[PDB]
């Protein structure tokens, strides 16, 4: 019912669940659906160690700033994405929800900042910014401004001025037990035969056998000098299996 | 990644891996020549010594 | 506040097994530092400690009665249950459950602050 | 509830941790990360001052009576900002992030039994508004040597640890051990300073001390045994001999002369020289036309 | 069980000080506690850890523990202080209560 | 100024002592310091005796562990 | 050549074909070396009838 | 190798690492040649005890 502002964007952590991205990708409700480092149609059969949903409301003309390598008032002072961002940016028009006849000034943005933000930085300071050489003492005045400005967000505003609800899904894949997996249909485990396999999103072909390698509890797989995986931990039985090419 | 954007990433790996393999083979041809010369000398010593 | 309520059979025959349940409120049996003990008091006699259970399922029993005493806890209902077997007429007493203050590091019982109302149990034919 | 009441040692080969969660065995692996430099000066406290966090912290303690209970991480360490409080108690470890108003001299108020091996809590005198994170798990717990590595990367507070017995009186062990991952906390806060929390009795304390070092961006060569355990490591920046080993990817170097690096004199200062023109460009006459 | 001995009774006049002793083997090493039980009622903790009162307990109640002997003292004993007083001590997890002292006023 | 750095070592089966050659530079520019035509050699003691070459430095100079 | 570069990927193999005979040339070069190694041994040792 | 290609640029050096050991291989090859040149001289002139 309520979204966060762009200056104080909200991070919701998604974990320990089964995801379904076909409900989002196949929805006509989204005006923007841009993925980086991953294809939307393949997103439904991968696993992640965590997923973060960063949400806020901005103007239509600001939507272009929600991308890798972009700059601007939002990109620099409110919400910054990394150049190597992996994830999907989703946005839709919310003029019928977030706009008000007298203006919806509940939503604001940062206009004044000493320096550009680092990726995923969130600045919630409300202290007065000194633009000149004389101190503010917490009081607004000449060269002393409150750092955040409000948006009009009226239902009669032009498309570029209307509010849009934005959700950015950041996908991280570290070497850890996946906490989020798309629509999944597991099968039985077969050993001592040449098989094609998918372990928590890891695809390959080879013979699987029980391993004598003593993995530590935080380790899910091992690697060779060629950067190939030569052992995995079964996600359900926690058994360590050796992987040898057919 | 999907097929138009996979063919960019893959081509980068092919180029690098192909270059690495060509480097290996060239070095082996040069080393082979050195061994051949040694073998020719050994064969001469076998005959004459 | 903290309260404890004893319930169970008020009459058993010789050689029968008695089960007493202590229903507690104001605290959980799964909470660290929590312990619940059982004590009996025969008519006109001094109190005798039987057993107590710790939140971590560790248990203490009186050496002279240990062979007849079993204590368990229900982690869902917040109840402590004491089972006393092979009872004789001489085991007639009022039974109480109470909260136990617990020392940490080397874990030891300290004192009983909150006591229940107690239940009288008679052993007879 | 608030009460208003260093030496240096040498860290020989301590502060090495498993850089990632990848299984490796019978292999020499080169990695670059924030590690405690070998043979470094580690600050020795006996004392609960607020210390800088820098890039990362190596914290070790030696104690018998469990006096050190936890740490506070943050910036201003007051009600103005979010801060991280990690405290061990009687049965568990409590990790919270809130706008805490900390005491001028925060601690746990604990009394002891007649037997010096037993204790009970009296009060808590460390500080909790606008809480955003809470986590509870098992306690982080001859003298006890407890080593921790604290890193803060992309909002994640990563804790590595190792707990071993020590038979030394007042120093760190001269030997190698790798620290394992303990917990990864998705917190998203700014940490620049931290403080150590002790359990005091009516206030004084028993005999305990702790050491604080700092991590640096350095390259190490790690040796994994047949069981996937790191048994040795080389700090490539320590000396020319270590540099050679790291270059050759071997812990043994034969007689000879090796090229290991290239030296380069660095710039002493930066200078800027532009024209002595002063007038401003007439851009206004173009755009404001 | 842990051996603990109390006097069978104490008798004082109102306004006087009552003194109830409790003798053990290792009371000088462990902590003692006292409970006050009225007829038909559950016992109430009066003193814990030798000399500490629970909230709600009148300042009339005090005590000490030395030389393997623990005591409970009631200063300005009232006629409402009539009860059976029991002492307890734990010997390294071994429980024990005294026989109980009947205090009259 | 820049150049190669070479490390001269007897072998770890013998010793952990090393000497460093700063190739093609003056000893005055580097900051047992011996200037050779191969560069500045530091950590080695120059002697006026002469032996069979052990570890070659260059320009007629060799080094060894004594 | 194909396995080293592409493993078991068909997408990679199809792209690799665009490079022509590079793989064949490398395989031929290594084969020539392998044959020479047996010739070298015979020239040295097989000098007796 | 690094200086020839990247000079003193850190941005370049970081990219160069993505190519693996190519620089190390080239340095090794040239070193091997340099050593041989001294061996060649000794083989010709140092024939007298
Ligand atoms: C030690 O910390 C633990 C964990 O936070 C406390 O345990 C919880 O305490 C709350 C009350 O704050 C109870 O409602 C929960 O039932 C407890 N849970 C568990 C699993 O025990 C514990 O009380 C603290 N103990 C002491 C002595 O400080
Ligand atoms: C579910 O997975 C866990 C390990 O994550 C395993 O211990 C447990 O046995 C599994 N349950 C079943 C029914 O396989
Ligand atoms: C505690 O001491 C500080 C000075 O160190 C003082 O400013 C503060 O007011 C004192 N707090 C109280 C409650 O006296
Ligand atoms: C450590 O400090 C001592 C002086 O106390 C100093 O001599 C030594 O060089 C220092 N070690 C390092 C690595 O800085
Ligand atoms: C505890 O330590 C004190 C000295 O601080 C000592 O007198 C006492 O006897 C010790 N208690 C035990 C049980 O050792
Ligand atoms: C939450 O933070 C606001 C300031 O942003 C403060 O006024 C409010 O009292 C805090 N709420 C709580 C429960 O601390
Ligand atoms: C953390 O706080 C310090 C001030 O102590 C500030 O200089 C720094 O920029 C802050 N970093 C972030 C990410 O807020
Ligand atoms: C590896 O583990 C085995 C037991 O499985 C043990 O006998 C051996 O000593 C260990 N190796 C090392 C280097 O610790
Ligand atoms: C026009 O002049 C005003 C100052 O009077 C300035 O703020 C504005 O940037 C100028 N427009 C230009 C240079 O395009
Ligand atoms: C290493 O030193 C030992 C004596 O400590 C010697 O026996 C051995 O032969 C040496 N190895 C080599 C390769 O010289
Ligand atoms: C550098 O070395 C040369 C000899 O190789 C010498 O002539 C010159 O004076 C030296 N420069 C300095 C500053 O010592
Ligand atoms: C070597 O001889 C020179 C003179 O030619 C002399 O100046 C130098 O000190 C001598 N060095 C040693 C180690 O004898």
PDB file of N, CA, C and O in Angstrom, chain G:
ATOM      1  N   UNK G   1      41.167 -30.033 -29.741  1.00  0.00           N
ATOM      2  CA  UNK G   1      40.959 -28.589 -29.852  1.00  0.00           C
ATOM      3  C   UNK G   1      39.549 -28.202 -29.428  1.00  0.00           C
ATOM      4  O   UNK G   1      39.364 -27.310 -28.597  1.00  0.00           O
ATOM      5  N   UNK G   2      38.561 -28.893 -29.974  1.00  0.00           N
ATOM      6  CA  UNK G   2      37.176 -28.580 -29.680  1.00  0.00           C
ATOM      7  C   UNK G   2      36.866 -28.758 -28.205  1.00  0.00           C
ATOM      8  O   UNK G   2      36.210 -27.913 -27.604  1.00  0.00           O
ATOM      9  N   UNK G   3      37.330 -29.854 -27.618  1.00  0.00           N
ATOM     10  CA  UNK G   3      37.055 -30.102 -26.207  1.00  0.00           C
ATOM     11  C   UNK G   3      37.731 -29.082 -25.303  1.00  0.00           C
ATOM     12  O   UNK G   3      37.125 -28.586 -24.356  1.00  0.00           O
ATOM     13  N   UNK G   4      38.986 -28.766 -25.591  1.00  0.00           N
ATOM     14  CA  UNK G   4      39.721 -27.804 -24.785  1.00  0.00           C
ATOM     15  C   UNK G   4      38.999 -26.466 -24.747  1.00  0.00           C
ATOM     16  O   UNK G   4      38.866 -25.848 -23.694  1.00  0.00           O
ATOM     17  N   UNK G   5      38.551 -26.016 -25.910  1.00  0.00           N
ATOM     18  CA  UNK G   5      37.915 -24.715 -26.040  1.00  0.00           C
ATOM     19  C   UNK G   5      36.450 -24.712 -25.589  1.00  0.00           C
ATOM     20  O   UNK G   5      36.021 -23.786 -24.902  1.00  0.00           O
ATOM     21  N   UNK G   6      35.669 -25.701 -26.045  1.00  0.00           N
ATOM     22  CA  UNK G   6      34.211 -25.658 -25.942  1.00  0.00           C
ATOM     23  C   UNK G   6      33.648 -26.663 -24.949  1.00  0.00           C
ATOM     24  O   UNK G   6      32.466 -26.609 -24.612  1.00  0.00           O
ATOM     25  N   UNK G   7      34.455 -27.610 -24.504  1.00  0.00           N
ATOM     26  CA  UNK G   7      33.916 -28.673 -23.676  1.00  0.00           C
ATOM     27  C   UNK G   7      32.847 -29.443 -24.444  1.00  0.00           C
ATOM     28  O   UNK G   7      33.096 -29.942 -25.542  1.00  0.00           O
ATOM     29  N   UNK G   8      31.657 -29.543 -23.863  1.00  0.00           N
ATOM     30  CA  UNK G   8      30.554 -30.252 -24.496  1.00  0.00           C
ATOM     31  C   UNK G   8      29.442 -29.310 -24.947  1.00  0.00           C
ATOM     32  O   UNK G   8      28.309 -29.742 -25.183  1.00  0.00           O
ATOM     33  N   UNK G   9      29.753 -28.031 -25.083  1.00  0.00           N
ATOM     34  CA  UNK G   9      28.779 -27.048 -25.523  1.00  0.00           C
ATOM     35  C   UNK G   9      28.631 -27.032 -27.034  1.00  0.00           C
ATOM     36  O   UNK G   9      29.611 -26.839 -27.761  1.00  0.00           O
ATOM     37  N   UNK G  10      27.407 -27.204 -27.512  1.00  0.00           N
ATOM     38  CA  UNK G  10      27.129 -27.168 -28.937  1.00  0.00           C
ATOM     39  C   UNK G  10      27.127 -25.735 -29.443  1.00  0.00           C
ATOM     40  O   UNK G  10      27.521 -25.465 -30.576  1.00  0.00           O
ATOM     41  N   UNK G  11      26.695 -24.816 -28.589  1.00  0.00           N
ATOM     42  CA  UNK G  11      26.652 -23.404 -28.950  1.00  0.00           C
ATOM     43  C   UNK G  11      28.052 -22.878 -29.254  1.00  0.00           C
ATOM     44  O   UNK G  11      28.253 -22.180 -30.250  1.00  0.00           O
ATOM     45  N   UNK G  12      29.026 -23.262 -28.423  1.00  0.00           N
ATOM     46  CA  UNK G  12      30.422 -22.907 -28.630  1.00  0.00           C
ATOM     47  C   UNK G  12      30.971 -23.564 -29.888  1.00  0.00           C
ATOM     48  O   UNK G  12      31.622 -22.908 -30.701  1.00  0.00           O
ATOM     49  N   UNK G  13      30.702 -24.855 -30.056  1.00  0.00           N
ATOM     50  CA  UNK G  13      31.234 -25.586 -31.196  1.00  0.00           C
ATOM     51  C   UNK G  13      30.778 -24.965 -32.507  1.00  0.00           C
ATOM     52  O   UNK G  13      31.552 -24.868 -33.458  1.00  0.00           O
ATOM     53  N   UNK G  14      29.527 -24.520 -32.547  1.00  0.00           N
ATOM     54  CA  UNK G  14      28.987 -23.907 -33.749  1.00  0.00           C
ATOM     55  C   UNK G  14      29.677 -22.586 -34.063  1.00  0.00           C
ATOM     56  O   UNK G  14      29.873 -22.243 -35.228  1.00  0.00           O
ATOM     57  N   UNK G  15      30.064 -21.856 -33.023  1.00  0.00           N
ATOM     58  CA  UNK G  15      30.781 -20.601 -33.205  1.00  0.00           C
ATOM     59  C   UNK G  15      32.212 -20.857 -33.640  1.00  0.00           C
ATOM     60  O   UNK G  15      32.767 -20.120 -34.451  1.00  0.00           O
ATOM     61  N   UNK G  16      32.806 -21.914 -33.106  1.00  0.00           N
ATOM     62  CA  UNK G  16      34.193 -22.241 -33.396  1.00  0.00           C
ATOM     63  C   UNK G  16      34.399 -22.545 -34.875  1.00  0.00           C
ATOM     64  O   UNK G  16      35.460 -22.267 -35.431  1.00  0.00           O
ATOM     65  N   UNK G  17      33.371 -23.078 -35.523  1.00  0.00           N
ATOM     66  CA  UNK G  17      33.445 -23.401 -36.944  1.00  0.00           C
ATOM     67  C   UNK G  17      33.698 -22.169 -37.803  1.00  0.00           C
ATOM     68  O   UNK G  17      34.186 -22.278 -38.926  1.00  0.00           O
ATOM     69  N   UNK G  18      33.366 -20.995 -37.280  1.00  0.00           N
ATOM     70  CA  UNK G  18      33.508 -19.759 -38.036  1.00  0.00           C
ATOM     71  C   UNK G  18      34.965 -19.357 -38.176  1.00  0.00           C
ATOM     72  O   UNK G  18      35.296 -18.433 -38.920  1.00  0.00           O
ATOM     73  N   UNK G  19      35.836 -20.049 -37.458  1.00  0.00           N
ATOM     74  CA  UNK G  19      37.253 -19.741 -37.467  1.00  0.00           C
ATOM     75  C   UNK G  19      38.002 -20.602 -38.470  1.00  0.00           C
ATOM     76  O   UNK G  19      39.212 -20.451 -38.648  1.00  0.00           O
ATOM     77  N   UNK G  20      37.280 -21.483 -39.149  1.00  0.00           N
ATOM     78  CA  UNK G  20      37.876 -22.287 -40.203  1.00  0.00           C
ATOM     79  C   UNK G  20      38.664 -23.471 -39.668  1.00  0.00           C
ATOM     80  O   UNK G  20      38.174 -24.243 -38.845  1.00  0.00           O
ATOM     81  N   UNK G  21      39.864 -23.652 -40.207  1.00  0.00           N
ATOM     82  CA  UNK G  21      40.645 -24.863 -39.996  1.00  0.00           C
ATOM     83  C   UNK G  21      41.681 -24.732 -38.889  1.00  0.00           C
ATOM     84  O   UNK G  21      42.548 -25.593 -38.749  1.00  0.00           O
ATOM     85  N   UNK G  22      41.604 -23.671 -38.096  1.00  0.00           N
ATOM     86  CA  UNK G  22      42.612 -23.465 -37.062  1.00  0.00           C
ATOM     87  C   UNK G  22      42.815 -24.708 -36.193  1.00  0.00           C
ATOM     88  O   UNK G  22      43.955 -25.087 -35.920  1.00  0.00           O
ATOM     89  N   UNK G  23      41.721 -25.353 -35.775  1.00  0.00           N
ATOM     90  CA  UNK G  23      41.808 -26.551 -34.940  1.00  0.00           C
ATOM     91  C   UNK G  23      42.489 -27.706 -35.659  1.00  0.00           C
ATOM     92  O   UNK G  23      43.311 -28.411 -35.074  1.00  0.00           O
ATOM     93  N   UNK G  24      42.171 -27.884 -36.930  1.00  0.00           N
ATOM     94  CA  UNK G  24      42.777 -28.951 -37.709  1.00  0.00           C
ATOM     95  C   UNK G  24      44.276 -28.740 -37.836  1.00  0.00           C
ATOM     96  O   UNK G  24      45.056 -29.688 -37.745  1.00  0.00           O
ATOM     97  N   UNK G  25      44.680 -27.492 -38.048  1.00  0.00           N
ATOM     98  CA  UNK G  25      46.088 -27.165 -38.207  1.00  0.00           C
ATOM     99  C   UNK G  25      46.876 -27.476 -36.949  1.00  0.00           C
ATOM    100  O   UNK G  25      48.004 -27.962 -37.022  1.00  0.00           O
ATOM    101  N   UNK G  26      46.286 -27.185 -35.799  1.00  0.00           N
ATOM    102  CA  UNK G  26      46.953 -27.412 -34.527  1.00  0.00           C
ATOM    103  C   UNK G  26      47.077 -28.899 -34.240  1.00  0.00           C
ATOM    104  O   UNK G  26      48.112 -29.365 -33.763  1.00  0.00           O
ATOM    105  N   UNK G  27      46.038 -29.654 -34.579  1.00  0.00           N
ATOM    106  CA  UNK G  27      46.054 -31.093 -34.376  1.00  0.00           C
ATOM    107  C   UNK G  27      47.121 -31.740 -35.244  1.00  0.00           C
ATOM    108  O   UNK G  27      47.829 -32.648 -34.805  1.00  0.00           O
ATOM    109  N   UNK G  28      47.247 -31.251 -36.472  1.00  0.00           N
ATOM    110  CA  UNK G  28      48.236 -31.762 -37.403  1.00  0.00           C
ATOM    111  C   UNK G  28      49.648 -31.489 -36.910  1.00  0.00           C
ATOM    112  O   UNK G  28      50.520 -32.352 -36.993  1.00  0.00           O
ATOM    113  N   UNK G  29      49.872 -30.282 -36.399  1.00  0.00           N
ATOM    114  CA  UNK G  29      51.189 -29.891 -35.916  1.00  0.00           C
ATOM    115  C   UNK G  29      51.646 -30.768 -34.761  1.00  0.00           C
ATOM    116  O   UNK G  29      52.795 -31.208 -34.727  1.00  0.00           O
ATOM    117  N   UNK G  30      50.743 -31.049 -33.828  1.00  0.00           N
ATOM    118  CA  UNK G  30      51.087 -31.873 -32.679  1.00  0.00           C
ATOM    119  C   UNK G  30      51.308 -33.319 -33.079  1.00  0.00           C
ATOM    120  O   UNK G  30      52.170 -33.998 -32.522  1.00  0.00           O
ATOM    121  N   UNK G  31      50.551 -33.785 -34.062  1.00  0.00           N
ATOM    122  CA  UNK G  31      50.723 -35.138 -34.567  1.00  0.00           C
ATOM    123  C   UNK G  31      52.099 -35.309 -35.185  1.00  0.00           C
ATOM    124  O   UNK G  31      52.768 -36.317 -34.957  1.00  0.00           O
ATOM    125  N   UNK G  32      52.525 -34.321 -35.961  1.00  0.00           N
ATOM    126  CA  UNK G  32      53.833 -34.368 -36.598  1.00  0.00           C
ATOM    127  C   UNK G  32      54.942 -34.491 -35.566  1.00  0.00           C
ATOM    128  O   UNK G  32      55.895 -35.248 -35.753  1.00  0.00           O
ATOM    129  N   UNK G  33      54.794 -33.780 -34.455  1.00  0.00           N
ATOM    130  CA  UNK G  33      55.761 -33.866 -33.374  1.00  0.00           C
ATOM    131  C   UNK G  33      55.786 -35.265 -32.786  1.00  0.00           C
ATOM    132  O   UNK G  33      56.853 -35.839 -32.583  1.00  0.00           O
ATOM    133  N   UNK G  34      54.608 -35.811 -32.515  1.00  0.00           N
ATOM    134  CA  UNK G  34      54.498 -37.126 -31.905  1.00  0.00           C
ATOM    135  C   UNK G  34      55.198 -38.189 -32.740  1.00  0.00           C
ATOM    136  O   UNK G  34      55.884 -39.057 -32.205  1.00  0.00           O
ATOM    137  N   UNK G  35      55.051 -38.104 -34.053  1.00  0.00           N
ATOM    138  CA  UNK G  35      55.681 -39.065 -34.947  1.00  0.00           C
ATOM    139  C   UNK G  35      57.196 -38.943 -34.903  1.00  0.00           C
ATOM    140  O   UNK G  35      57.912 -39.944 -34.876  1.00  0.00           O
ATOM    141  N   UNK G  36      57.678 -37.711 -34.893  1.00  0.00           N
ATOM    142  CA  UNK G  36      59.103 -37.439 -34.836  1.00  0.00           C
ATOM    143  C   UNK G  36      59.756 -38.062 -33.612  1.00  0.00           C
ATOM    144  O   UNK G  36      60.894 -38.519 -33.678  1.00  0.00           O
ATOM    145  N   UNK G  37      59.043 -38.079 -32.494  1.00  0.00           N
ATOM    146  CA  UNK G  37      59.609 -38.586 -31.252  1.00  0.00           C
ATOM    147  C   UNK G  37      59.962 -40.063 -31.350  1.00  0.00           C
ATOM    148  O   UNK G  37      60.921 -40.521 -30.726  1.00  0.00           O
ATOM    149  N   UNK G  38      59.208 -40.807 -32.148  1.00  0.00           N
ATOM    150  CA  UNK G  38      59.509 -42.218 -32.346  1.00  0.00           C
ATOM    151  C   UNK G  38      60.645 -42.382 -33.330  1.00  0.00           C
ATOM    152  O   UNK G  38      61.493 -43.263 -33.174  1.00  0.00           O
ATOM    153  N   UNK G  39      60.698 -41.501 -34.316  1.00  0.00           N
ATOM    154  CA  UNK G  39      61.791 -41.499 -35.270  1.00  0.00           C
ATOM    155  C   UNK G  39      63.109 -41.216 -34.569  1.00  0.00           C
ATOM    156  O   UNK G  39      64.122 -41.849 -34.861  1.00  0.00           O
ATOM    157  N   UNK G  40      63.092 -40.281 -33.626  1.00  0.00           N
ATOM    158  CA  UNK G  40      64.290 -39.910 -32.893  1.00  0.00           C
ATOM    159  C   UNK G  40      64.867 -41.098 -32.144  1.00  0.00           C
ATOM    160  O   UNK G  40      66.069 -41.345 -32.183  1.00  0.00           O
ATOM    161  N   UNK G  41      63.997 -41.854 -31.486  1.00  0.00           N
ATOM    162  CA  UNK G  41      64.435 -43.011 -30.724  1.00  0.00           C
ATOM    163  C   UNK G  41      65.045 -44.069 -31.631  1.00  0.00           C
ATOM    164  O   UNK G  41      66.080 -44.649 -31.310  1.00  0.00           O
ATOM    165  N   UNK G  42      64.404 -44.317 -32.766  1.00  0.00           N
ATOM    166  CA  UNK G  42      64.890 -45.330 -33.694  1.00  0.00           C
ATOM    167  C   UNK G  42      66.242 -44.962 -34.280  1.00  0.00           C
ATOM    168  O   UNK G  42      67.117 -45.813 -34.409  1.00  0.00           O
ATOM    169  N   UNK G  43      66.433 -43.685 -34.584  1.00  0.00           N
ATOM    170  CA  UNK G  43      67.683 -43.233 -35.180  1.00  0.00           C
ATOM    171  C   UNK G  43      68.860 -43.457 -34.249  1.00  0.00           C
ATOM    172  O   UNK G  43      69.972 -43.730 -34.707  1.00  0.00           O
ATOM    173  N   UNK G  44      68.624 -43.336 -32.949  1.00  0.00           N
ATOM    174  CA  UNK G  44      69.689 -43.493 -31.970  1.00  0.00           C
ATOM    175  C   UNK G  44      69.957 -44.955 -31.637  1.00  0.00           C
ATOM    176  O   UNK G  44      71.108 -45.375 -31.577  1.00  0.00           O
ATOM    177  N   UNK G  45      68.906 -45.718 -31.354  1.00  0.00           N
ATOM    178  CA  UNK G  45      69.084 -47.054 -30.798  1.00  0.00           C
ATOM    179  C   UNK G  45      69.030 -48.170 -31.834  1.00  0.00           C
ATOM    180  O   UNK G  45      69.735 -49.169 -31.706  1.00  0.00           O
ATOM    181  N   UNK G  46      68.197 -48.021 -32.852  1.00  0.00           N
ATOM    182  CA  UNK G  46      68.013 -49.090 -33.825  1.00  0.00           C
ATOM    183  C   UNK G  46      69.064 -49.014 -34.920  1.00  0.00           C
ATOM    184  O   UNK G  46      68.739 -48.862 -36.096  1.00  0.00           O
ATOM    185  N   UNK G  47      70.326 -49.118 -34.528  1.00  0.00           N
ATOM    186  CA  UNK G  47      71.433 -49.030 -35.472  1.00  0.00           C
ATOM    187  C   UNK G  47      72.069 -50.381 -35.711  1.00  0.00           C
ATOM    188  O   UNK G  47      73.091 -50.486 -36.387  1.00  0.00           O
ATOM    189  N   UNK G  48      71.477 -51.412 -35.140  1.00  0.00           N
ATOM    190  CA  UNK G  48      72.027 -52.748 -35.247  1.00  0.00           C
ATOM    191  C   UNK G  48      71.065 -53.661 -35.991  1.00  0.00           C
ATOM    192  O   UNK G  48      69.869 -53.681 -35.712  1.00  0.00           O
ATOM    193  N   UNK G  49      71.594 -54.403 -36.955  1.00  0.00           N
ATOM    194  CA  UNK G  49      70.783 -55.285 -37.785  1.00  0.00           C
ATOM    195  C   UNK G  49      70.263 -56.482 -37.001  1.00  0.00           C
ATOM    196  O   UNK G  49      69.141 -56.939 -37.215  1.00  0.00           O
TER     197      UNK G  49
END
